[PDB]
From a paper:
HIV-1 and other retroviruses integrate a DNA copy of their viral RNA genome into the genome of the host cell, a process that is mediated by the virally encoded enzyme integrase (IN). Each step of DNA integration, up to formation of the integration intermediate, occurs within a series of stable nucleoprotein complexes (intasomes), involving a multimer of IN and a pair of viral DNA ends. Because integration is an essential step in viral replication, intasomes are targeted by an important class of antiretroviral drugs, the IN strand transfer inhibitors (INSTIs). INSTIs work by chelating the two Mg2+ ions, blocking the active site and inhibiting the strand transfer activity of IN.
We began by analyzing the structures of the intasomes with single-residue substitutions, E138K, G140A, and Q148K. In the G140A_DTG structure, the introduction of a methyl group affects the side-chain orientation of the nearby residue Q148, inducing a metastable preference for an altered rotameric configuration in which there is a change in the rotation of +120° about the γ-carbon. If the position of the side chain of Q148 was not altered, the methyl group of A140 would approach the amide moiety of Q148 to within ~2.5 Å, introducing a weak clash that would destabilize the rotamer that is preferred in the WT intasome bound to DTG. In contrast, G140A and E138K cause less marked changes. In contrast to G140S, the mutation G140A does not have free protons to donate, and it should not contribute favorably to the energetic environment. Consistently, G140A, by itself or in combination with other DRMs, generally does not restore enzymatic activity or viral infectivity. Instead, it modulates the conformation of residue 148 when a drug is bound, positioning the residue closer to the Mg2+ ions.
Residue numbers in the entry:
A (entry chain D), B (entry chain J): 222 to 268
C (entry chain C), D (entry chain I): 212 to 277
E (entry chain A), G (entry chain G): 1 to 228, 236 to 268
F (entry chain B), H (entry chain H): 2 to 44, 57 to 139, 149 to 228, 235 to 270
Amino acid sequence: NFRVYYRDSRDPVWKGPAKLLWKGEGAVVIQDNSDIKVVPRRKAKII
Amino acid sequence: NFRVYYRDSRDPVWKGPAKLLWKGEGAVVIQDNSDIKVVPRRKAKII
Amino acid sequence: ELQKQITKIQNFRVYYRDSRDPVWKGPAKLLWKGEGAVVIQDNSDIKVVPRRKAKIIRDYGKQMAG
Amino acid sequence: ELQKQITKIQNFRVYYRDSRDPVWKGPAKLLWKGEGAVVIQDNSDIKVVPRRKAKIIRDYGKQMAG
Amino acid sequence: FLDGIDKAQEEHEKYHSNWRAMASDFNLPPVVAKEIVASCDKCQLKGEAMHGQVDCSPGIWQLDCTHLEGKVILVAVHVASGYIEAEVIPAETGQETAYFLLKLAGRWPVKTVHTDNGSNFTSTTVKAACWWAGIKQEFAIPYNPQSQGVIESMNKELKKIIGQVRDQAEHLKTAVQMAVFIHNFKRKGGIGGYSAGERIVDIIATDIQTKELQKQITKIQNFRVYYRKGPAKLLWKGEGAVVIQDNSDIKVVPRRKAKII
Amino acid sequence: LDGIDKAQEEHEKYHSNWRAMASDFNLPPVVAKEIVASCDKCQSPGIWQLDCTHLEGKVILVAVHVASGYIEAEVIPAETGQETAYFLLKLAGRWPVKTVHTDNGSNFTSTTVKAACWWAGIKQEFGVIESMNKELKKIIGQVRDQAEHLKTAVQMAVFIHNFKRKGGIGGYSAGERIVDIIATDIQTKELQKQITKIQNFRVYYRWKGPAKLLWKGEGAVVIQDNSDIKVVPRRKAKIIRD
Amino acid sequence: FLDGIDKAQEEHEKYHSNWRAMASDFNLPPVVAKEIVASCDKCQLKGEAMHGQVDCSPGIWQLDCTHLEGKVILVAVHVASGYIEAEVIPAETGQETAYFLLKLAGRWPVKTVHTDNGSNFTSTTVKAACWWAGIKQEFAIPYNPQSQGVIESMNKELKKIIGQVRDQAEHLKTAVQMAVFIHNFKRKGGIGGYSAGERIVDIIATDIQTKELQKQITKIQNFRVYYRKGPAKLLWKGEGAVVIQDNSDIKVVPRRKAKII
Amino acid sequence: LDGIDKAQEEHEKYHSNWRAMASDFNLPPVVAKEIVASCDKCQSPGIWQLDCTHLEGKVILVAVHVASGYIEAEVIPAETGQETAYFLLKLAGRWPVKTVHTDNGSNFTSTTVKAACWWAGIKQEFGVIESMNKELKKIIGQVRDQAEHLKTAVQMAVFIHNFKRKGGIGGYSAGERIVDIIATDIQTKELQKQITKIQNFRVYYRWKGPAKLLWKGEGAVVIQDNSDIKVVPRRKAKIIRD
DNA sequence: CGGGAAAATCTCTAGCA
DNA sequence: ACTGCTAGAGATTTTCCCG
DNA sequence: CGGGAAAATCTCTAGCA
DNA sequence: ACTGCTAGAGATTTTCCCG
Ligand SMILES: C[C@@H]1CCO[C@H]2Cn3cc(C(=O)NCc4ccc(F)cc4F)c(=O)c(O)c3C(=O)N12
Ligand SMILES: C[C@@H]1CCO[C@H]2Cn3cc(C(=O)NCc4ccc(F)cc4F)c(=O)c(O)c3C(=O)N12
Ligand SMILES: [Mg+2]
Ligand SMILES: [Mg+2]
Ligand SMILES: [Mg+2]
Ligand SMILES: [Mg+2]
Ligand SMILES: [Zn+2]
Ligand SMILES: [Zn+2]
């Protein structure tokens, strides 16, 4: 599995860790507390 | 001589042409209507 | 018949990018075109490129210039 | 006397930049230090560099590491 | 490193020293210190330094609203060519965005529209407009203007041209149409030295012609290729290399260890 | 290069145009153009007709690209010079309009429209448009129930005419035809630009008298001397500008 | 090109076509079209794509005010080392900026301060503070934060650390001092793998030591060099090259065509 | 390498420290440290004293770096634990403070101060500070007329003491001395780190028994075997980690 | 001299607001 | 006459270590 | 094959707000 | 499951043109 920490939407506070559902080129799809979110890779760190 | 067109201070409108008084690395000193101004080279075009 | 169509399709120029390179490569020669993939030859190198990363044209200026 | 002082001054490391390069060069050897200019040797190349573009130190870690 | 590690984590819990600091202060291998950092939730504060790339298929247009002199300008750009269409609208509403989109779809082959999540672009009216015109709707990740880098850059270029010619028109709408004219036909550059209008004509005509030519080629050239497998469909051959599509997987294989039947 | 004589023979036998000779015989377009222009026995894309129609008490201003059948139409609030000038500036921004054909109406002879034409470089000249108004009205009557407002129905009709209705020899839509025609016009303008660039050069080969320069290739130079085309090596000829 | 030029300028006056557009449309050399563009005042809308470089002399500090949780934080950074000093202040005033500056000058050898044109930094009180402490004042070009790239970047780093440790302190001032501690001594990196505190100590000690060593060398090594000229003062010799200073102009010349007397 | 025997002889004759042997004989600091530690007959920078003084009805909290004479002082609103903890956290952020010496006062034994010391890793222990309070008071009386408020005069006095007053053997200011002392401490810590890193390695050379590793050079390996230092080629020895 | 693993250098980004 | 920078993430290249 | 001049490619920036 | 880009200024490299 992977840990994803991310910045979602105009909120400077980094959140996580979220479960990595999908990694594309440019963006990732994650699940954090049952809330699926789409985050650009500029705004996420996958560990 | 040189023609200088420049953006001075938070004003999006480009002005000029101004007389080039001094060219340094990073900034230029110009005279426009007897008003000496210091402008970064990022905000000026010397012709 | 087939050879004329093939050379006609190879007359087209392809501009493209790689997945992690924002710069656009020079005009590569078009070999095959699909719905989602394009097959090109760039400097004696055959590359498959997704359709969303390829700009295909003719360049009329060169087709007139010979 | 003079030779000891000279080798001591050449033990110092110089980090510097060129007028149009934002990247910092590797540790060059210090040859002479002035008020506004520093003279360095970088890869068998003697360069004069303005004082405002030079960070001079020793790097204690290497002076202990030999 | 059991003692060194434990003293490191205690230091990190208080100060959150980076991996270099703990490695130096506690004689740890870089992997261990980086493990201590990576296992700290509060130290995960930066994403990878990269930029994605937006779709440039011949059918995608990017739409956005911009604002100038208190008015709203609806702007669309053909991503592949940079050809633009703009119009001043009295209000950012789904009705008039849908009308603009209907006009655009009636003038050019619009397959896909890519917009931010402004209420006008997410409106029910625009959804109905796209459905009738057969246009697929794509919405950027919210508050990520980079996903619209093309149209956002065109907003800058359009405003730039409007300022240049703003004094030859009394009204802003006339200046916007003048700027659209100048961009599409009086500015040459890019991948073919074309104007935007010339480039979009070339792109669309080339798409049509290549579709027809490849249709004829596939009608004539019908072969199956065995390499290394199954009867992969033949795509292209020559120059000692063969391009095949095996189970919707296009791959390039050399002429050796491959037979065309 | 090698096919110039074959192209000359084919043109003499069949009166072929330069495009056919260039495509079949692998020749640069300039050489084929010279061949086709060398015989005296062998001797539109920017034209639009603009008119206003009336429907349901509203004014619909229609533009037709004559060569292709492509239609640009929108409901306008009134039949005045200002709206006509705005529409024509829009069209000139979208497509390469060089000449507009109109019916000498009040909105078409206004000073605003003339100023717009002068700004966009459009030439004003005062039966296709009538038949196409009829066709657009037919499509509008077909798709009127799908919209509340007349303008939306008009744009649906424009979309349908340009892309969903196909006909002619090749069974193409209006949009395809206009794209092809504009591409051909672009090709013609590029060829003209290159011909203009090269026609100011003279070549001295083997020295013989000046000859018209046709092509400056990587391995040869194509020239026209005494109404005849000869291929000479680059190192055997000198090219000067007059 | 007299006809071609004139038709080009008439086109440019109306549309402001770029040099490529006029060159293609009017068969002009690139120089002529670029001349038409460059001679148009309204087309001069962009500056050169470059970035300057800020002074990094051992004595320069960059000061700025930042804002966090409704409070004011005065921040100073030693540019050469990245070592920082920060303090929460109740108001952006010249009085307390001058007090902060007096403390800093009393703790470290501050030769020059570089600030933006905020009223606190341009205040008469700060000018008097600098004059008594012998500190030269440098002010950025107004509304050019890039001239303060170092301190502005440090503002980001300091706020970043404050967020990390904000929960171990009740008050913001304690968190700011904790963040200053962490930055100066618990983060290693940069040109020597140093912490900021270690780096500033190295920089200052190295400056002192090099000054003393070069003073002794110049006291001992007193020579005049003739090359190619006048009696240029000798600076350094060896490895087949000689470094000299002729009339306050330091230049490097080879050992050949040079004599040391 | 070649100078190890000379360094051993010099150390035996003159009881020199490792710094002198390393500097004079061009040896790595670890080898000189081993030489100086090999003889039994041859056998501060982070210490600060903190105290409060009273002046004009205001509390001045003074910090003195014992080794150098460097002074950090500021007027504080009250002699409580909170202000002392804030000042000490400030100092720990500015300079590498490891131990603080105090007078067992109420503000120094407070839980806030102990918590600050625990956070910053400062060790608390309960005549230099008295004399330096006297000197600071003298400078304050010298420069009091130059300021309206006592805090500004105190900071002027701190500046003057640290940088304008010079003395001692070398005639250096307090700031120069503290910078030099901290640089020496940094050197010592780096040497200790490298010694700790290398002391876990054993070398088998020419095979002979394990030997302590001292230096791993580009052209040689320096080892210590049977209380004696020998230089062996890298290709003639194998280094393993135990 | 040859690969593999770790170290070092390099490339690029957000935020400073 | 003055001037983008910093430090972390991920990629790619050097160096070194045993054969 | 050798330099010089022009063309082409490359590097980097602000603004989109 | 999605994604920075564009075009102009200045620098540096290729190509070509006559010897
Ligand atoms: C009222 C004083 C006097 C004059 O001007 C204002 C406005 N200002 C604006 C920024 C700012 O825009 N930072 C973002 C940023 C952008 C680019 C970059 F390279 C570095 C950067 F930090 C500041 O940081 C700042 O301190 C001020 C300030 O103090 N003042
Ligand atoms: C209310 C809708 C819905 C949701 O979000 C807001 C806010 N927003 C913000 C920007 C903006 O920040 N542009 C500057 C920029 C920065 C970086 C980059 F790569 C490209 C850029 F254009 C827009 O352009 C924009 O259209 C919107 C918008 O429409 N909306
Ligand atoms: Mg928007
Ligand atoms: Mg936008
Ligand atoms: Mg500020
Ligand atoms: Mg700031
Ligand atoms: Zn942490
Ligand atoms: Zn212009």
